[PDB]
Amino acid sequence: TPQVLALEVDCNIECASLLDLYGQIEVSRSTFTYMKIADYGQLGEYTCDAKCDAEFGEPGNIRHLEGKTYDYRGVFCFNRKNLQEANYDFLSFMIGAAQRSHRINRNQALMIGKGVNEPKGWLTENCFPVFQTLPVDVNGTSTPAFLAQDWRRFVTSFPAEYGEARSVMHQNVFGYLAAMVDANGRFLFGDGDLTFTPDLVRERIRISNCLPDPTEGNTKGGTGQDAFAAGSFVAAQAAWKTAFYAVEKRPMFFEQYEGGSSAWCVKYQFGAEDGGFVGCCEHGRILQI
Amino acid sequence: MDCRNLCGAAAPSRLVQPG
Amino acid sequence: MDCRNLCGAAAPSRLVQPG
Amino acid sequence: MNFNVGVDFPSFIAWDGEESFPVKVDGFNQFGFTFKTIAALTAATTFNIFYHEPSDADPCVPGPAIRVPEVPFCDTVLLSEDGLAAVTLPETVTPDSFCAGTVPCMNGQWISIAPATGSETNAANVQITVTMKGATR
Amino acid sequence: MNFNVGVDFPSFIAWDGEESFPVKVDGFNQFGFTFKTIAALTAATTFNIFYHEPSDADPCVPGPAIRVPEVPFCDTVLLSEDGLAAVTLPETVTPDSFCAGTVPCMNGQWISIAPATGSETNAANVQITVTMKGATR
């Protein structure tokens, strides 16, 4: 007889995730609304102690704006007798894979959500201030390129008053950066180390592969071969706990779709409700070509 | 007398600072 | 209508990225 | 005590009798439809709804005009021959009484209303405009 | 899930860029103006505001155009020429950038907006609508 152990290999990668960085907000019935405090107007004037009167100042705006939340639905069958036999539990696996697919679709939505019935992605919305690299004039052509100087000047130019802000990019980008060399043949940044290794634990490096990389796979743009493609996205940096907000309404729910199911079949119905919006995009900044 | 909206222009920029 | 198969012809690849 | 209701529900012209007007519903997320006649009607009139996508030229300018497929709710009895959403202003509507309308599911970044063919003479006496509700930014 | 917002804050055309239109506000209690530029302007453009009375020939037709007077409050120390409600949209107001306005105190039966003398050619490139609020009829 065969032996049964209690381990299960997965061998399936989801992605890197950016749902932890965004400002989490739990909500209720749809059409949420909140405040948009615009700018505190200069109230005082400063005073010499001579006059028996003050002077007024400009007021500010509030702009109680709002937003809608979107939903996610799905259905799937099951045989009835096939479920009692066939020792493995198909039901829990379907539940888990549905929650996971919903999670990955949520992650894709918050980044590149295309407007209509799609949580407006902060990439396509584009109210973030964006800087771009400068081209280099190799043998008199001024081709678009990118070196570490542009990276620093992008990361440092951030106003530290906003608080500590996280920077995100693709792992192909991290690799291409780490693969930079001086004229000596010596390394570049991330110098002293046979380690390199993207620790990235909290400090300013963070990687997601389900972001658009400007390396077109690899060995592209930047490479001894064909030059780089301009206008391509590179990286972002924001205080996501306040730069962009993700809103949740109802956990993934499943239900036996009574009606359409019989003593020989079962039909199910699952759904959930979530969304996201931009917070103060005047915090985060983007790097392009 | 006021509202707000800013298309998206966003005019990406360079930094340039050599020695 | 499905199965899986492979033998280890995972011929290694190069990376080079100069500046 | 009137509130400034231009900072909420800003309205835009859609059809001034003889000219369509693409309105951008990107930032907003609820919007309706208001029809106002200015003179007497002759026959019933219909209007075709169209929607636009961001033209590759400029991301916040409209592109072409594609018809809008209507989705019917539960408890519907017919389907417009093509399935494309279109509204009807019936005959015998006095020019001092508004009419309301709303597509239940939007698509695209610009909405547009056009006088349905064979009913363009009456369109002059019709004025259509839309307000919005959401801000989102 | 855009609700039918035709009812519950409808709107109408007030200034098409070529001629004004009286829009009844008697059946409402709050209202405001939404301005929108169709092209780049040339200077700060002024608009005069007027209110009408029911022409005793017919209680539902336009009478004369009385000019609503400007009303101040605490910090308003910039009164106009003895007081007249009039607005002015400054320069640096591009397309896809709408503006909002209202009148502090109601008077008459309906409002109307007209290009102030000198701002006509620029008014030819602006669209103004009116949206109401709160009505009970």
Is chain B touching chain E, with at least 3 CB–CB pairs below 8 Å? yes
**Residue A140 burial (10 A CB sphere; 0-12, 13-18, 19+):** exposed
Residues in chain E: 137
Residue A238, strand partner residues: A166
For chains E and C, having 3+ Cβ pairs within 8 Å is answered: no
Looking at beta carbons, which residues of chain B come within 8 Å of D7? 2-3
Question: DSSP 3-state assignment of D84?
Answer: strand
Residue D13 identity:
I
Q: How far is B8 from chain E (nearest CA, A)?
A: 11
**Are D7 and A63 inside 8 Å of each other by CB?**
yes
Measure the CA–CA gap between C18 and A249, rounded to whole angstroms: 48
Nearest-Cα residue of chain B relative to residue E86: B1
Q: Are D39 and D125 in contact (CB under 8 A)?
A: yes
Q: How far apart are CA A93 and CA A101, in angstroms?
A: 12
Does A181 reach chain C within 8 Å, measured CB to CB? yes
- Per the entry, the structure determination technique was cryo-EM
Q: Is E57 on the interface with A (CB under 8 A)?
A: no
> Cβ(D56)–Cβ(E92) under 8 Å?
no
Distance from CA of E23 to the nearest CA of D (A): 10
Q: What's the CA gap between D107 and A132, in Å, rounded? A: 32
After what residue numbers is chain C broken, C–N > 2.5 angstroms? Answer: none
Closest C-alpha among E121, E134, E124 to residue E31: E134
Task: Determine whether E67 is exposed, middle or buried from the number of CB atoms within 10 Å of its CB (0-12, 13-18, 19+).
Answer: middle
Nearest partner of B9 among A283, A150, E97, A236, judged by Cα: E97
**Residue D68, CB half-sphere, CA atoms under 13 Å: how many?**
26
Q: What gap in Å lies between CA D83 and CA D70, rounded to an integer?
A: 6
Residue whose pair of structure tokens reads 């008459």 in the numeric block: E108
Beta strand extents in chain D (DSSP E only)? 12-16, 23-24, 33-37, 45-52, 66-67, 86-89, 99-101, 110-115, 126-130
Contacts of A225 (CB under 8 A, 6+ apart): A219
B5 touches chain E (CB under 8 A): yes
Q: Do the beta carbons of residue E46 and residue E88 sit within 8 Å?
A: yes
Could you give the CA distance from residue E28 to residue E10 in angstroms, rounded to a whole number?
11
CA distances from A200 to A181, A204, A212, E124, E137 (A): 22, 7, 19, 58, 64
Instruction: Give the 3-state secondary structure of residue C5.
Output: coil
Strands (E), chain A: 23-26, 32-33, 66-67, 70-79, 130-132, 166-169, 235-238, 244-256, 265-278, 285-288
H/E run at residue E33 = strand E30-37
Task: From chain E, pick out residues whose CB is under 8 angstroms from the CB of D130.
Answer: 11
Test A131 with B15 for CB contact under 8 angstroms.
Answer: yes
Distance, in Å, from the CA atom of D101 to the CA atom of D88, rounded to the nearest integer, reads 10
Residues 6+ apart with CB under 8 A from B9: none
Nearest-angstrom CA–CA distance, A102 and A122: 19
* Number of alpha carbons in the 13 Å side-chain half-sphere of residue A21: 25
Query: How far are the Cα atoms of D13, E93, E99 from residue E44, in angstroms, in the given order?
Result: 22, 9, 13
Q: Which residues of chain E have a CB within 8 Å of the CB of A68? A: 1
Query: Do you know the residue count of chain D?
Result: 137
Query: Cβ B1–E99 below 8 Å, yes or no?
Result: yes
Q: How is residue A134 annotated by DSSP? A: P
Rounded-to-integer distance, Cα E105 and Cα D121, Å = 40
Coarse DSSP helix, strand, coil percentages of chain C, rounded to the nearest 5 percent:
0, 0, 100
Q: Please, are residues E114 and E14 in contact by the beta-carbon 8 Å criterion?
A: no
Residue A264 identity (one-letter amino acid): W
Determine the Cα–Cα distance for residues A241 and A116; give it in Å rounded to an integer. Answer: 25
Are A110 and A103 a contacting pair, CB within 8 Å?
no
Number of H helices, E strands in chain E: 1, 9
Q: In this complex, is the C-beta atom of C18 within 8 Å of any C-beta atom belonging to chain A?
A: yes
CA distance E51 to E23: 10
DSSP E116: P
